[PDB]
Amino acid sequence: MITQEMKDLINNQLAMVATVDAKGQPNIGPKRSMRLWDDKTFIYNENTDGQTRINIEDNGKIEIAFVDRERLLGYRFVGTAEIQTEGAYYEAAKKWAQGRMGVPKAVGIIHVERIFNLQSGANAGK
Amino acid sequence: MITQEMKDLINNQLAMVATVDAKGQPNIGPKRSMRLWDDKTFIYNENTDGQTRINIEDNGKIEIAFVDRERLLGYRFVGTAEIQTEGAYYEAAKKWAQGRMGVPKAVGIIHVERIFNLQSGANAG
């Protein structure tokens, strides 16, 4: 679902993540550890329990955008998120962090459901 | 309440804008025209009838972020927003657009309530 063209941009740009709290306030922030798990899934290392973790545990809603500012290209990924503290995703996030950052409090997992282009704005699911 | 360092980042980086629709779904998109108006206000040129505009019109809630791709630097600005199609901001937005982009459909105005230093600073004001 995530194409090699998309992967290239993902691996060259910063993940910008939007979530929402209970009262409907959007929250935005970069996730510099955001990376692909497979062709339909992102993971990131959750180290702080900031608002993003709270929002995901509340309602699971999320959007991730990557933009190539220079070439005016990008992608928006829409899906469901969860937080895990045990299991395969978490242990992988733990190993990835070793020698790199602190031991993760949790791992965030994003299940991609729809993909949109960020020049056009059109659904790029084919 | 705006640092010169903040102004530098804002001028050199792309605003990413988060809003929410009437059903509570988040939306994120870039707005290259997002720019500081004064120390408590951003504006951007709205050239579309897209989701960011729809969401601002619905509930006014917004957060914007400017982040350096290559360095651990950036700022988050949280506040409320409105869309205008007439008045002084809109006239200013039209003048700004010439030689930069198309004639705007509207102007978005963001009233800053809180500032966050993103990767190294927590709150900044």
Numbering used by the authors:
A (entry chain B): 1 to 126
B (entry chain A): 1 to 125
The authors write:
Hence, spy49_0662 was expressed with a 1.4 kDa C-terminal V5 epitope tag used for Western blotting followed by a His6-tag for immobilized metal ion affinity purification, and the resulting protein was coined as HupZ (heme utilization protein Z). The tagged HupZ is a small-sized protein previously shown to bind heme, and it exhibits a trace heme degrading activity in the presence of NADPH and cytochrome P450 reductase (CPR). This protein shares some protein sequence similarity to the members of the IsdG family. In summary, a comprehensive biochemical, spectroscopic, and structural characterization led us to propose that the observed heme binding in HupZ is through its His6-tag in a sandwiched di-heme complex from two subunits with an oxygen-derived bridging ligand.
Next, HupZ was crystallized in the primitive orthorhombic space group of P212121, and the structure was refined to 1.7-Å resolution with one dimer in an asymmetric unit. In this new structure, six and seven additional C-terminal residues are present in Chains A and B, respectively, compared to the previous structure. The C-terminal region, including the His6-tag, still misses density for 39–40 residues. Comparing the structure of H111A to the wild-type structure, the two superimpose well with an r.m.s.d value of 0.99 Å over 237 Cα carbons, indicating site-directed mutagenesis did not induce an undesired global structural perturbation. His111, as shown in Figure 7, is located on the protein surface in the homodimeric structure. The ligand-free HupZ eluted at 18.0 mL, corresponding to a molecular weight of 36 kDa when compared to the calibration curve using the known molecular standards on the same column under the same separation conditions. The molecular weight of monomeric HupZ is 18.5 kDa, and thus it eluted as a dimer. In all experiments, the higher-order oligomeric states were observed only when heme was present, indicating that heme binding to HupZ induces oligomerization, resulting in higher-order structures. Our results indicate that each subunit of HupZ binds heme in a 1:1 ratio. Collectively, the rR data coupled with the UV–vis study indicated that the heme in the binary complex is in a six-coordinate, low-spin ferric state with at least one histidine as an axial ligand.
